[PDB]
Design a protein around this ligand. Sequence first.
Ligand code: HEM
Ligand code: HEM
Lengths: 28, 28, 68, 69, 57, 57, 244, 244
Amino acid sequence: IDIQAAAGWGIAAAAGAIWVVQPFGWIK
Amino acid sequence: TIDIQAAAGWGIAAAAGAIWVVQPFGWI
Amino acid sequence: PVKLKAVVYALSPFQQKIMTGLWKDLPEKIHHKVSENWISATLLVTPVVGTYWYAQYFKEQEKLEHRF
Amino acid sequence: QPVKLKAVVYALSPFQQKIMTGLWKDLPEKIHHKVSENWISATLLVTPVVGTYWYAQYFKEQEKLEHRF
Amino acid sequence: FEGFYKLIMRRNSVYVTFIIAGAFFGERAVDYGVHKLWERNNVGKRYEDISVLGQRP
Amino acid sequence: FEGFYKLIMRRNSVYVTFIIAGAFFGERAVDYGVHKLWERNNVGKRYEDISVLGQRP
Amino acid sequence: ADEAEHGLECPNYPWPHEGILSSYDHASIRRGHQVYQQVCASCHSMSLISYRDLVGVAYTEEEAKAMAAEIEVVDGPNDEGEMFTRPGKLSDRLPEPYSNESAARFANGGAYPPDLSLVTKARHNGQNYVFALLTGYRDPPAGISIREGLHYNPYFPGGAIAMPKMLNDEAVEYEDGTPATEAQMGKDVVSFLSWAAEPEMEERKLMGFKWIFLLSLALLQAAYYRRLKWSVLKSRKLVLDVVN
Amino acid sequence: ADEAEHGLECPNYPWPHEGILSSYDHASIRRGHQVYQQVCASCHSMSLISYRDLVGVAYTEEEAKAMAAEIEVVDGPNDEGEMFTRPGKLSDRLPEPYSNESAARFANGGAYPPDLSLVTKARHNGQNYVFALLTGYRDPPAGISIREGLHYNPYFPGGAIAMPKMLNDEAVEYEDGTPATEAQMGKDVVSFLSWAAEPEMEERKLMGFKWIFLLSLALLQAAYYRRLKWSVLKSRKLVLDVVN
Ligand code: HEM
Ligand code: HEM
C-alpha cells in the first residue's frame, strides 16, 4: 500500500511532466 | 449643553489643523 | 441553534436519473414562467423599446424637414 | 489553558514616582555588570574579525613587497 | 480491458494518470480535427496555394 | 504646572488644538534657528555674496 | 445639415475572411501588397509592418529578402561617427514616405495621410469603409461645390477628401495575370490592409473554434456534476407537523 | 601590474562644502563653470545640466538668458518640415561637444570623454580624485614607458590616460581677477562639478539638521512616555509563596 502507491504517484508525476512539457524531439 | 461646546471646541481644532496642514498665508 | 422537529428521507445520487428532469413537465415550466413574469417583462421591455422607436421617429422627421 | 495563580501584587501610580532618574543610577555597577558577564561573548565576536582583518593586511603588505624590484 | 479498468476506479494515482492521458490525447484529436475542417473550408486561400509563389520579378 | 493644566489639558479639544499650535510654531522657530546657524557658518559663500554677480559681459 | 457630416454609410461586402471558420485569401494579400508598393506607399506609411512579417503569408524568405535589399535604410553611426545607408534586411520596417508629419502635410496640401497599419481597425466597419471610400469617387450632388484641391467622396465624412482617385484601371501590373480593374485592386488592397491590422486572426479563429467546443463539453459535464451532487437534496422527502 | 592597476590613492582635501552645516562656495561655483565652458566643454558633455539650473546658484536670470542665447540649438520641424536652428533658452541643456559616442572616440584616439554631470558621484572619493587627477600630471616612474597619445597620470587606473594635461597656468581668465593658477582652477572646477552632481545638497543638509534635532527631542519624550506607562509594572512588589 506504500510502495505501490509511491510507484503509482511517481508514474502520474512523470506522465504530468510529459504532458505539461512536451519533450518530443528531445527523446533522442 | 456640553455637546454644543464639544462641537465648537472640535471645530476650532479642525480649523487650526486645516491652517496647519495647508498654510495659505500667501493666499489670504 | 434552532430547535427543529422533522423527518427527512433521502435517496443516493447513484440511484436516480440525473438529467431527464430538465425536459420533464416542460409545458408547465413554460406556463409558470410566462404567467408569473409577463408584467415584469412588460415593465422592462416597453420603456426601452418605446423610447428607442420614438427617437428614430424623431430623427426621421428632423432629417426630412431639413431637406430641400 | 489559563494558569491558576496565588500571589499578592502591590503597585504604585505612575504619577507618584520619578520617571527618568533611574537611568543614571548605580551607573558604575551597570558598567561592571555589562562587562563582567559579557567579556567572553565580546571576545568570541571581536577576536576572529580583528585577527582575520589584521592577517589579510599583513599578507597583502608582504605580498606587495615581494613583487617590488 | 479489465486490468486497466479495475485499476482506474480503484487507485486515484491510476485515475489521475488516466485524466492526464485523456487531456493529452483528447486535445490533440480536437486540434487535428479542427484543422482538417479549417483546411477543407479554405481551399485555394492558403499561403502555399499562391500560383506565383517564388517569382517576385 | 497645574495652572497651565486647568487651561489647556481640561478638554481634549483644547489639548489637541494646543498640540497643533505647538507643532506649527515650534517647527517655524526651529526652522528659523537652523537658518541662522547656517548663515553664520557660511559667511561670504552664498549666491548673494558673489562680487561679479550681474556683471557678466 | 447633419447628413453630410457623418457621410454616406458603407454597404456590407462578403469578404473572404469573414466567418468563424474563414481564412485570409493569401493570393489576394500578395496582390494587395503589390498595390501598396506601387500606389499607396508614395504617401502612406506602414510603420508596424516589417519585411519578415510577409514571410510565410505572401512571400517566401528569399522573395522578402530581395524586396528588403532593394531599399535604402539609414544606419550608423560607423566607427568615425557618421551615419550611412545600407540595403534593407528582413527585420527592417516598411520605409516611410516622409521624414515627419509636417513634411507629409506640406506635400499634401496640409492634410496628413494616416498610417495604414491599423486603418481597418481604426474606423467603424473598417474593411467595408475602406473599399467603399476607394471606389466611391463620384460627382457631388446638385448644389454642392468643392473647394480647390479637394475631391468629393460621399463616404468620407463631410464629403471633401484631400486624397485623389488613386485606384484607376491598370494602375498596377499583377504577376498572376488577373485583370487589374478598379474593384479588383480595391478588394486586394483592403485584404492586405485587413491582414496587416490583424495578423493573428487565423490563429485566433482556430483557437476559438477548438476551445468553445471543448468548453461546451465541459459545460455539459458541469451541469451533470451539479445535478448529481444536488439530487440527494432535491429528491428528499421532508415531513413536518405544521399545516398552515 | 600590481599597484599601477588600481592607481595612486588621492588625498583628503578640505573642501569648503564639507561639514554638516557647510554650503557650497557659490563664487567658486561660478568660477568653476567658466573653466568648464572654456576648457572642458570642448570635449566633455554635461547633458544633465540646464541653463536654468545656474540661476540663483551662480548667475542671475538675465546672465543665464544671455548665456543660452550665445549657442545654436537644433529645433523643428517647421511648417514646411525642415529642422532649423534657434538661439538657446533657459530650459535648454548644455550643448554636446560631439554628435554621438563614436564621434567622440574618433576625435580622442578611441577614448570617450565621459559625461561629467555625475562624475564626482561616479568615482570613489569623487571630489578628491578629480582634483588629484587634474593636478597630478607628472613624469612616469623609472622603467615605465607611455605609448604615443597616452599621458602618464598616477591617479588614473593603469597610469595611462588619453586625456592630455589641460589645467595649464593661466588657461582661463577669471571675472573677479582671481589668479588662475592650475591648483586654483582645479579647485573651482571640482566645486562646480560637485554642485552639478548634487545640486540639492544645501537643502538636504538644512533638512537633516532640522529633523535630526527634532527627532532627538521626540526620542527623549518617547523614553519618558515608555517609562511612565511601565513604572507601575517595574516598581511593583510581587509576593509569592515559593522559596527555592
Ligand atoms: C490605393 C492607395 C491608397 C489607399 C488605400 C489609401 C488609404 C487612405 C485612407 C484609409 C485614408 C483615411 C480615410 C479616412 O480618413 O476616413 C486616406 C487618407 C488620405 N490619403 Fe490615402 N490612400 C492611398 C493613396 C494615397 C495617395 C497616393 C495619396 C497622395 C498622393 C494619399 C493621400 C491621402 C490624404 C491627403 C489623406 C487625408 C484625406 C483627408 O484628411 O481629407 N493617399 N487614405
Ligand atoms: C579642465 C578640463 C577637463 C576636465 C576637468 C575633465 C574631466 C575628466 C574626468 C573627470 C575624466 C574621467 C577620468 C576617469 O575616467 O578616471 C576625464 C577623462 C577623459 N577626458 Fe576629459 N576633462 C577636461 C578636458 C578634457 C579635454 C580638453 C580633453 C581632450 C582634448 C579630454 C579628454 C578626455 C578623455 C579622452 C578622457 C578618457 C581618458 C581615458 O579613459 O583613457 N578632457 N576627463
